[PDB]
Design a protein around this ligand. Structure first.
Ligand SMILES: Nc1ncnc2c1ncn2[C@@H]1O[C@H](COP(=O)(O)OP(=O)(O)O)[C@@H](O)[C@H]1O
Length: 322
């Protein structure tokens, strides 16, 4: 009488109809809902997400230690959203943002809303007010930790020293998500997890997110033996719109953003478009140079190649039709 796959498809169906598409899913599954998305600025991370980038109208949490490449992504995400003619807001609570570096990643700074809240309540509340005007495509809150409650800010005693900063973050997200879905704004929270919850407030963010990225630093790019950039490693630990747990890597050169050419090489090799004699890179017969850097340089100067490689890697995977 029983047929496990039949009874299982049925189960899953009911499950998703009760809690939302993606509440349960086979990892090897290949999602075909192309969503609305905001390119991460990293082809690999975009593919890692399985949907081409950050989903729209969702709470995204990008965590990791200082200098791991988080902000940069966050910024690239803002740049891509703006080229699509979208409006961006930046709830700054750290006062670190280097707009000069931002423009370099393609961000139109003169049109970027910025706010520098006095208290945690304020910060979130200002983000909420903006979000629910449906004008914004993306909003970035720098530093989950920085959202300290007002009571703590103003001199207030070690009396009523409850876990209020996390309750703060729960109530705020309880109501913002609603707006975020209707508005379609993607909200990236930047949780610098460094130095019981991930920064006190990220405990409630662990559940409200639709996507959580574990940004980490893994190597220092040198080519020979000198300071150039660093290779980041992102892990999609949570993904409610596609099979989670995938991993993507990329290079961020000092003063520049996520290296396109760099990626192209990586993405290329793992897909046999570009062959890597051991320590020499080549493409369709053409020699790119020894050392990932000479090739990087090669592809930067020979804009024609790279562009056809991007084509091939894209053709094979996505950013296409549906
Ligand atoms: N203001 C800046 N000027 C030059 N390079 C920067 C700047 N900000 C970030 N970078 C580059 O981006 C890399 C990652 O930094 P970032 O992602 O901003 O730190 P975090 O992980 O705290 O967000 C840095 O190692 C550097 O290569």
């Amino acid at each position: 009488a029983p047929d496990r796959e039949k009874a299982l498809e049925l189960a899953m169906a009911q499950i998703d109809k009760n809690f939302g598409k993606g509440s349960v899913m086979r990892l090897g599954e290949e999602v075909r809902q192309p969503i609305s998305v905001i390119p991460t600025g990293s082809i690999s991370l975009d593919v890692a997400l399985g949907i081409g980038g950050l989903p729209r109208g969702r709470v995204i949490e990008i965590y990791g230690p200082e200098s791991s490449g988080k902000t940069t992504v966050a910024l690239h995400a803002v740049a891509n959203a703006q080229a699509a003619g979208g409006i961006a807001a930046f709830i700054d609570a750290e006062h670190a943002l280097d707009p000069e570096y931002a423009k370099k990643l393609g961000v139109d700074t003169d049109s970027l809303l910025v706010s520098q809240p006095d208290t945690g309540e304020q910060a979130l509340e200002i983000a909420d007010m903006l979000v629910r005007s449906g004008a914004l495509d993306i909003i970035v809150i720098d530093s989950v930790a920085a959202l300290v409650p007002r009571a703590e800010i103003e001199g207030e005693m070690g009396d009523s020293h409850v876990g209020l900063q996390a309750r703060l973050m729960s109530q705020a997200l309880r109501k913002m998500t609603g707006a975020l879905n209707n508005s379609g704004t993607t909200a990236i929270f930047i949780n610098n997890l460094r130095e019981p919850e991930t920064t006190t407030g990220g405990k409630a963010l662990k559940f409200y997110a639709s996507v959580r990225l574990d940004v980490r630093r893994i190597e220092t790019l040198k080519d020979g033996t000198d300071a150039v950039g660093n290779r980041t490693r992102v892990k999609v630990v949570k993904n409610k719109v596609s099979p989670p747990f995938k991993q993507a890597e990329f290079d961020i050169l000092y003063g520049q953003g996520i290296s396109r050419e760099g990626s192209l090489i990586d993405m290329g090799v793992e897909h046999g478009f570009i062959r890597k004699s051991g320590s020499w890179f080549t493409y369709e017969g053409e020699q790119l140079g020894q050392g990932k850097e000479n090739a990087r340089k090669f592809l930067l100067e020979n804009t024609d190649v790279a562009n056809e490689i991007e084509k091939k890697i894209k053709e094979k995977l996505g950013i296409g039709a549906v």
